[PDB]
Amino acid sequence: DDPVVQEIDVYLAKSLAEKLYLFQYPVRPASMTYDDIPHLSAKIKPKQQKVELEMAIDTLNPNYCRSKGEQIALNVDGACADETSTYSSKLMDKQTFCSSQTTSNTSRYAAALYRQGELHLTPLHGILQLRPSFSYLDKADAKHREREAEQARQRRVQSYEFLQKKHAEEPWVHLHYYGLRDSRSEHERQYLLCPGSSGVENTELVKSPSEYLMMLMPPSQEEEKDKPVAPSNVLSMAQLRTLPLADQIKILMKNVKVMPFANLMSLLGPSIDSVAVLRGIQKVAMLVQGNWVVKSDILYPKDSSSPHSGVPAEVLCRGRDFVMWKFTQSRWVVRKEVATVTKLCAEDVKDFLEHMAVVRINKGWEFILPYDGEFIKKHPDVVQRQHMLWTGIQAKLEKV
Amino acid sequence: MLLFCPGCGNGLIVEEGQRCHRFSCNTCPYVHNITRKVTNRKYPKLKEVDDVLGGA
Amino acid sequence: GKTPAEFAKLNECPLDPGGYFIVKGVEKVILIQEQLSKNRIIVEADRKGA
Numbered sequence: 479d480d481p482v483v484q485e486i487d488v489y490l491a492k493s494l495a496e497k498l499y500l501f502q503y504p505v506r507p508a509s510m511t512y513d514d515i516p517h518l519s520a521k522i523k524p525k526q527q528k529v530e531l532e533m534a535i536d537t538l539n540p541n542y543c544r545s546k547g548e549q550i551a552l553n554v555d556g557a558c559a560d561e562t563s564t565y566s567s568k569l570m571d572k573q574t575f576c577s578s579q580t581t582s583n584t585s586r587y588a589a590a591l592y593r594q595g596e597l598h599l600t601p602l603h604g605i606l607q608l609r610p611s612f613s614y615l616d617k618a619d620a621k622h623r624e625r626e627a628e629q630a631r632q633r634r635v636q637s638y639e640f641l642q643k644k645h646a647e648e649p650w651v652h653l654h655y656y657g658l659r660d661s662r663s664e665h666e667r668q669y670l671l672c673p674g675s676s677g678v679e680n681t682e683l684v685k686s687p688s689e690y691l692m693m694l695m696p697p698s699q700e701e702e703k704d705k706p707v708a709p710s711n712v713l714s715m716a717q718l719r720t721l722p723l724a725d726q727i728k729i730l731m732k733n734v735k736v737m738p739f740a741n742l743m744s745l746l747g748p749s750i751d752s753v754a755v756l757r758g759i760q761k762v763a764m765l766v767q768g769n770w771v772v773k774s775d776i777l778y779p780k781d782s783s784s785p786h787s788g789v790p791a792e793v794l795c796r797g798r799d800f801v802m803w804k805f806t807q808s809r810w811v812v813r814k815e816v817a818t819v820t821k822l823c824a825e826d827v828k829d830f831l832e833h834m835a836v837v838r839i840n841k842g843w844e845f846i847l848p849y850d851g852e853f854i855k856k857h858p859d860v861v862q863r864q865h866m867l868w869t870g871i872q873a874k875l876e877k878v
Numbered sequence: 879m880l881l882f883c884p885g886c887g888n889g890l891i892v893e894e895g896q897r898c899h900r901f902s903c904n905t906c907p908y909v910h911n912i913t914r915k916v917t918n919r920k921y922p923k924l925k926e927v928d929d930v931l932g933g934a
Numbered sequence: 935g936k937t938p939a940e941f942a943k944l945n946e947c948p949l950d951p952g953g954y955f956i957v958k959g960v961e962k963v964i965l966i967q968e969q970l971s972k973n974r975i976i977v978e979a980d981r982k983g984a
């Protein structure tokens with residue numbers, strides 16, 4: 479299913495960005511508006527923008543209890559004093575509304591005007607709710623009550639009075655009201671119709687979806703707690719992020735004892751440098767019966783000792799090297815006596831037998847897997863090079 | 879059923895109208911004068927059938 | 935991080951659970967406590983039914 483219909487363009491206007499404000503009355507249902515009502519004064523405090531209105535209301539009309547209007551008019555103002563009179567007339571001919579700020583950030587909100595074939599957008603410089611003022615009771619109460627009637631430090635930074643002083647520091651800026659019926663409205667409404675062609679490639683919106691995702695939701699932590707050299711247990715199938723390849727194979731080969739290389743490039747990726755990894759595998763492994771086997775010297779660091787809960791002993795790698803030699807010379811270790819052949823005990827040697835081999839009844843151990851096609855790769859020097867290694871280690875062990 | 883003053887948004891209350899009875903705002907001079915007849919519907923629940931038919 | 939072969943030199947046992955303290959020479963445990971959840975509204979009927 480394809481985007482087959484209503485492919486309307488989009489436009490943006492900055493002409494009214496700092497001028498747009500959104501006003502709503504939760505108390506006023508949408509079915510009528512204030513078009514017929516003259517607003518007799520309007521006001522703004524631009525700094526910390528907040529709005530007040532003043533408007534007229536009919537009095538002669540039957541839904542007006544003029545007697546009640548007079549009786550409360552005599553009370554909200556001084557009955558005959560009118561020091562700060564809100565109504566020179568003795569009737570409530572006017573009302574006033576207050577406003578409330580809705581959010582501290584309007585940037586993510588914009589006005590949109592729909593037209594056939596085009597959409598025009600513009601931000602909003604503010605959104606305020608509107609409130610009907612109930613303060614006239616308050617001043618009736620004040621009238622009745624009045625008729626009836628260096629310095630130390632403080633920890634009052636969060637004071638109401640302090641923020642009211644900050645609020646009072648801004649005097650009220652007044653405006654002249656003009657309703658929606660004024661041709662002024664359309665005369666300015668046209669400004670939102672921004673000029674331009676039907677469509678041009680945008681200078682922005684260049685980033686790719688993957689890129690868009692990363693900077694949309696950035697890492698909460700900018701620096702990792704430990705290094706990818708695996709000071710702690712770490713992912714294996716998710717390839718180590720920046721680790722040099724020669725160390726990547728070291729990590730992989732501390733897990734598995736023996737491994738034919740042909741499955742590796744699945745782990746390090748097909749793009750791996752084949753020649754380089756062949757140069758690196760010699761540094762960590764030595765081949766027996768067609769398979770690259772871990773070097774003992776890197777399996778045991780120098781300061782090692784008999785780990786298992788048996789006879790303590792130093793780092794005697796010579797014996798494990800000898801069992802590797804037995805695997806190299808012979809087809810497989812058919813004999814049990816290989817422990818006493820090198821005058822070792824059962825625990826000393828048993829664990830390395832289970833590194834690669836599996837048991838056959840009364841006939842010892844053989845590898846779990848057979849000789850594979852390493853000869854398919856052209857580098858016969860490797861078997862000779864290992865041959866000199868076998869010869870040297872043989873010369874050492876012959877001293878027994 | 880609750881009713882609010884268009885003038886000030888507060889709930890309207892019935893009063894002793896001078897000629898016809900009256901909703902009036904407690905504070906603002908807005909008023910409303912009863913012209914039509916009006917009722918609200920309750921429709922309470924009745925007894926169940928089991929023991930109203932059981933035993934005749 | 936020690937190895938079982940070098941546990942023996944500390945006279946400690948490889949299998950010991952750990953997780954407890956030693957105070958004045960007597961091994962002590964801090965039992966897991968169970969609390970009711972907080973900052974979460976709940977409505978209920980009193981003994982009087984209200």
Ligand SMILES: [Zn+2]
Pocket residue numbers: 882883884885886887888889890902903904905906908
């Ligand atoms: Zn009212």
